[PDB]
Design a protein around this ligand. Structure first.
Ligand SMILES: [Mg+2]
Lengths: 230, 50, 76, 50, 49
RNA sequence: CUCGA
């Protein structure tokens, strides 16, 4: 009776988003303790990238319209919140969009640099209807954690930003939903051992080999205040 | 007795807070009490929170 | 005597005398400048009076004697 | 005397007149908060004792 | 002191108030003096009623 | 006068 320690044994990709990670082996109690202390951290705080500020030329606020587009500009701001990017080198980038001609404006038409990579290129942003009409915007992407609304950012700034720089609400977390299952492990003599199958579902801006390592680094950091300091 | 009149049109956007009256279609009223985190809501065995 | 005032009212006798006695005592520390007897432990001048009452250190006869002796001391 | 809508306002610094334009009326699309001045209007006051 | 815009009440005193949380409103009055502040602690506190 | 408890 000493212990047995788990290990990251298997990772498979159902789709570009859906993944299923197993851990093996566990004892009796720890199969249902780690499986609930890894859902409560992977949903709350995981670092991702999100769109923060959109600046379309010719337009002052978000409650007007532009010529030759189907949606209002507020619908374009609602479309640009669901954009799954991945910034590797820097910590804040600015992307440009330019389009002219009849047809939709997909997310693949953004002139990206070498580091950022729009992972879902079939996204839909706008709809152009006239030949002479065009669109042009600059899009700021930051790195964050959790959910930061627009009122907090407009309250926690002091420099005068120019009229036209619209603000978007930022939801940073990549993980959409996550479940876990505990099945009887396949060990030949220690029969009552358990395994833990964490079933992750996200968008394409995270790696399931890295998310569990971040979510266990956080848990081994927060328990460091319990192991020595009383 | 009036020289000139200026009219200014604001545009307030309002989220939900603790206090905003919500109600169904069958006459069940209510006041929102707490905005939980996502991981505290009861979830079924497929992962979807309520 | 922060949560409930059951300990204090069983010494003075009724609530309407407890209120007047504690309001008289709580003004000698507000602007008179007299020092409290119980340790303060970060409280306003009302709860210090309601705690001085409940430990037998402040009454109506004591609050009359303690100011009449000081009026005689002001006479000297 | 008549009242006037001027960008000049007494007893108020630059921190509130940043969004007022040349003529004294706020720009279209300027994000305002509680207490900020939208139209700068001053009124003449008859002289009082001190 | 809580953030938000709604007076949070204890769930046990609602039998006395006859207050259902379906859009009710309650008024907030402050006592100013030092006698009235002692008539709200020894006479009208909710742990005495 | 219409609405809310
Ligand atoms: Mg009601």
């Amino acid at each position: 009776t000493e212990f047995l320690k788990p290990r990251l044994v298997d990772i498979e990709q159902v789709s570009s988003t859906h993944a299923k990670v197993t851990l093996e082996p566990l004892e009796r109690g720890f199969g249902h303790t780690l499986g609930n202390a890894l859902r409560r951290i992977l949903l709350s705080s995981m670092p991702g990238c999100a769109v923060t500020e959109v600046e379309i030329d010719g337009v002052l606020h978000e409650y007007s319209t532009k010529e030759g587009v189907q949606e209002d500009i507020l619908e374009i701001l609602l479309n640009l919140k669901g954009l799954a990017v991945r910034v590797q080198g820097k910590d804040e980038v600015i992307l440009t969009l330019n389009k002219s001609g009849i047809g939709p404006v997909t997310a693949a038409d953004i002139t990206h640099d070498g580091d950022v990579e729009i992972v879902k290129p079939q996204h839909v942003i706008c709809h152009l209807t006239d030949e002479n009409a065009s669109i042009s915007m600059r899009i700021k992407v930051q790195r964050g954690r959790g959910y930061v609304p627009a009122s907090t950012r407009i309250h926690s700034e002091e420099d005068e930003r120019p009229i036209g720089r619209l603000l978007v609400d930022a939801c940073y977390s990549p993980v959409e939903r996550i479940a876990y299952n505990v099945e009887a492990a396949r060990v030949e003599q220690r029969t009552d051992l358990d395994k833990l199958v964490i079933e992750m579902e996200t968008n394409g801006t995270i790696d399931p080999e890295e998310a569990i390592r971040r979510a266990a680094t956080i848990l081994a950091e927060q328990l460091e205040a319990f192991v020595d300091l009383r | 007795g009036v020289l000139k009149i200026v009219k200014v049109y604001l545009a307030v956007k309002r989220r939900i807070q603790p206090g905003d009256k919500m109600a169904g279609r069958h006459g069940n009223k209510g006041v929102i009490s707490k905005i939980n985190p996502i991981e505290d809501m009861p979830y079924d065995e497929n992962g979807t929170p309520v | 005597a922060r949560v409930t005032v059951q300990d204090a009212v069983e010494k003075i006798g009724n609530r309407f005398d407890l209120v007047l006695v504690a309001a008289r005592r709580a003004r000698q520390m507000q602007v008179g400048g007299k020092d409290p007897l119980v340790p303060e432990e970060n409280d306003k001048t009302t709860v210090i009076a309601l705690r001085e009452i409940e430990e037998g250190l402040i009454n109506n006869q004591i609050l009359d004697v303690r100011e009449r002796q000081e009026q005689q001391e002001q006479e000297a | 005397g008549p009242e006037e809508i001027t960008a000049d306002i007494p007893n108020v610094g630059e921190a509130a007149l940043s969004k007022l334009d040349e003529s004294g009326i706020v720009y279209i699309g300027a994000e305002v908060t509680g207490g900020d001045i939208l139209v700068g209007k001053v009124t003449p006051k008859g002289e009082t004792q001190l | 002191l809580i953030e938000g815009k709604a007076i949070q009440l204890h769930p046990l005193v609602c039998a006395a108030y006859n207050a259902d949380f379906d859009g009710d409103q309650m008024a907030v009055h402050v006592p100013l003096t030092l006698e009235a502040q002692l008539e709200a602690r020894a006479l009208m506190m909710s742990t005495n009623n």
